[model samples]
Target: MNYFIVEVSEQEVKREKEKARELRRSQWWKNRIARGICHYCGEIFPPEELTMDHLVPVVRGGKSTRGNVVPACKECNNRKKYLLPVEWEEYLDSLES
Candidate 1:
């Protein structure tokens, strides 16, 4: 059930995690949270309540670039849980039942 690859070294993932931490303090990230919009749910939340989500998760070998990161509502981010875009769509569709 996990999509993570062992090919990505632990050191690489650690480096990316550190990079993401610095990015968490970036001006753009600050302003984005200030805007309080969740890319996943399109809902407004308080800046402090918003959390960063990786569209392609680091465990899945995604880089810590701006293109891969965005703010998501806490609920959505937790539920999304490292799912890729297409996988998220499938998860949404599963609600039809």
Candidate 2:
């Protein structure tokens, strides 16, 4: 099963987004983006080209916490977009072929 289907309120979603916004100003996030490594693809890029993304996702009950998030390039981030789970495993597996 996909197992990622879930939901939360609009207000809660905003709070999680705000946390990420704050995290971006912190050195932890600074260093993370400075490394310019996309967590999924594990490729290097410019920090400016990177973005913070959640593994669980906000609407799907994800929090904007450090352990739950990672830096991703626009392409890879959007390529996966709103899909994950087994599809994520598929993406990783396809990378080797």
Candidate 3:
């Protein structure tokens, strides 16, 4: 369901991945994942089943910071692809309507 077509530079991709790696090592991210909640879908999952997802995807120029990331299930993460939080909410609203 991805609709955004962002052009991410190799340098940006590398930097983003590095940020993600650092975040993964932090207690903040660990605790967030341990809570096992999908920020987008509001679903509960096992801690191991959760993955860190960017609220505004890195490809779309989002920072890999605590405020920009959330724990999501694999399905939601894949489905979200490159959408921002506002866009994702609009997508969900459209589905509901």
Candidate 4:
């Protein structure tokens, strides 16, 4: 089976004692907010409202590493719930059309 690589946060990775701290921080997760864009809805949101999201399904053994996380708006994050990233994207696209 193929795997989709994603970015997560160092803080989150360290939050639950699952991975080592020596892991390299993913720049994609770091730079995204500096650029100001929501990973889920693809909309511009304030820095305070920007929220972290998991690209892979957590139940499927997705770790909290920076490579498995992304930034999203609070609204999008809530709507996303536990659904897969691609599923959320499709739902968003459906609402647009």
Best by TM-score: 2
Residue-by-residue lDDT tens digits, candidate 1, 1-97: 8685457789989988988998889998999899998887777899988988888889879878789989988778987876777888886666532
Which stretches of model 2 miss by more than 4 angstroms? 1-6, 82-87
Angstrom error of the Cα, residue 55, model 2: value is 0.4
Between candidates 1 and 2, the TM-score winner: 2
> Which of the predicted structures, 3 or 4, would earn the higher lDDT when compared with the native?
3
Over the full model, what C-alpha lDDT does candidate 3 score relative to the true structure? 0.83
Model 3: runs farther than 4 Å from truth? 1-8, 82-97
For all predicted structures, in order, the TM-scores are: 0.79, 0.81, 0.74, 0.56
Report every candidate's CA lDDT: 0.84, 0.85, 0.83, 0.64
Better of 3 and 4 by TM-score: 3
Query: Model 1 clash pairs?
Result: none
Query: Alpha carbon lDDT of residue 65, candidate 1?
Result: 77
Scored by lDDT, the top model is: 2
Clashing pairs in 3: none
TM-score order of candidates, best first? 2, 1, 3, 4
Ranking by lDDT: 2, 1, 3, 4
Task: Report how far off residue 94 is in candidate 2 (Å).
Answer: 2.6
What's model 4's overall lDDT?
Answer: 0.64
Clash-forming residue pairs, model 4: 6-67, 6-68, 7-66, 7-67, 7-68, 7-69, 8-66, 8-67, 8-68, 8-69
Q: Write the per-residue lDDT of candidate 3 for residues 1-97, one digit (tens) a residue.
A: 8696668898998899899989988999999988887887777899899988887778778889999988989877876776776886786676531
Q: Between candidates 1 and 2, which one is better according to lDDT? A: 2
